[PDB]
Design a protein around this nucleic acid. Structure first.
Length: 279
DNA sequence: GCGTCCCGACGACG
DNA sequence: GTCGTCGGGGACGC
């Protein structure tokens, strides 16, 4: 491919009722926080000036977090989570402008809380949850575990949503439909697009329930991806997958202004995604 | 430098 | 068009 390029439409900062947006969440799988910062990733984040920033795959210890993270005047409330043992693997973080009411780590399950994958920041009008969903790996070695994770996750998210509107962002590790990736046929047996994962995503949307912010607004918009393998000039050709989302409770739709995909932002095999809400 | 963890390009085919 | 097979980018802890 290549010619079937994608140009993400301008930012729409107005709710369906006309109310101007008041919240701007940005999520980004950085593929190594340290490496990302060296690649001018934070510089891009200052330009976006989000209210909240959620990062996945930081692969960094809190002892080793760069000093540049204390030069973000608009995101002074910083929260991190890393695996209990696997140093430099996985890793998630959330940076907020305002102080969250409450902040939690994990999904309350001893079994799925060892790889630094989830952070929960509760605000007044809603609950934010950023995540880095387990990769089923090459040879699908971890597909059995992934399904167990998928169950625990939706059960946990359903619980949150029951007490307050929910927003889940980050790398959910699945291209839901065929429209979510460049090659549906040739990646049917690959991690990220196996039937078990796609079904796990579908059950998630219906169980909680949750709505795919981007797809909700752009039902038929194709060629919109968030990940491109570093191999074979895939990005330059736009042969990627849509693995990063912003899922919201249905009751947040009337508050949805836009869901953007920042295709031009570099620094990782994933690009950032941004959400706008008139809250 | 290695071990490890996060898939598009293509002959082969009929 | 679909089915294997192969060559194959980057960040990190050791």
């Amino acid at each position: 491919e290549g010619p079937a390029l994608y140009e993400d439409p301008p930012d729409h900062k107005t709710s369906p009722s006309g109310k101007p947006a008041t919240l701007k969440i940005c999520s980004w799988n950085v593929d190594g926080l340290r490496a990302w910062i060296k690649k001018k990733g934070l510089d891009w984040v200052k330009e976006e000036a989000p209210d909240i920033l959620c990062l996945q795959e930081t692969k960094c210890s809190e002892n080793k977090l760069p000093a540049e993270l204390q030069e973000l005047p608009g995101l002074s409330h910083q929260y991190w989570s890393a695996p209990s043992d696997k140093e430099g693997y996985s890793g998630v973080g959330l940076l907020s402008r305002q102080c969250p009411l409450k902040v939690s780590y994990g999904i309350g399950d001893e079994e799925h809380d060892q790889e630094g994958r989830v952070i929960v920041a509760e605000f007044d009008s809603f609950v934010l949850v950023t995540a880095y969903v387990p990769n089923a790996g090459r040879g699908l070695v971890r597909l059995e575990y992934r399904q167990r994770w998928d169950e625990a996750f939706r059960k946990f998210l359903k619980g949150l949503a029951s007490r307050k509107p929910l927003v889940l962002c980050g790398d959910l590790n699945v291209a839901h439909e065929e429209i979510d990736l460049r090659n549906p046929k040739g990646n049917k047996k690959n991690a990220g697009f196996t039937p078990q994962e796609r079904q796990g995503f579908g059950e998630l949307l219906q169980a909680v329930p949750l709505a795919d912010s981007f797809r909700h607004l752009y039902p038929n918009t194709p060629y919109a991806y968030t990940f491109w393998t570093y191999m074979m000039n895939a990005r330059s050709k736009n042969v990627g997958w849509r693995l990063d989302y912003f899922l919201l409770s249905h009751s947040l739709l009337p508050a949805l202004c836009d869901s953007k995909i920042r295709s031009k932002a570099l620094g990782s095999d994933h690009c950032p995604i941004t959400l706008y809400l008139a809250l």
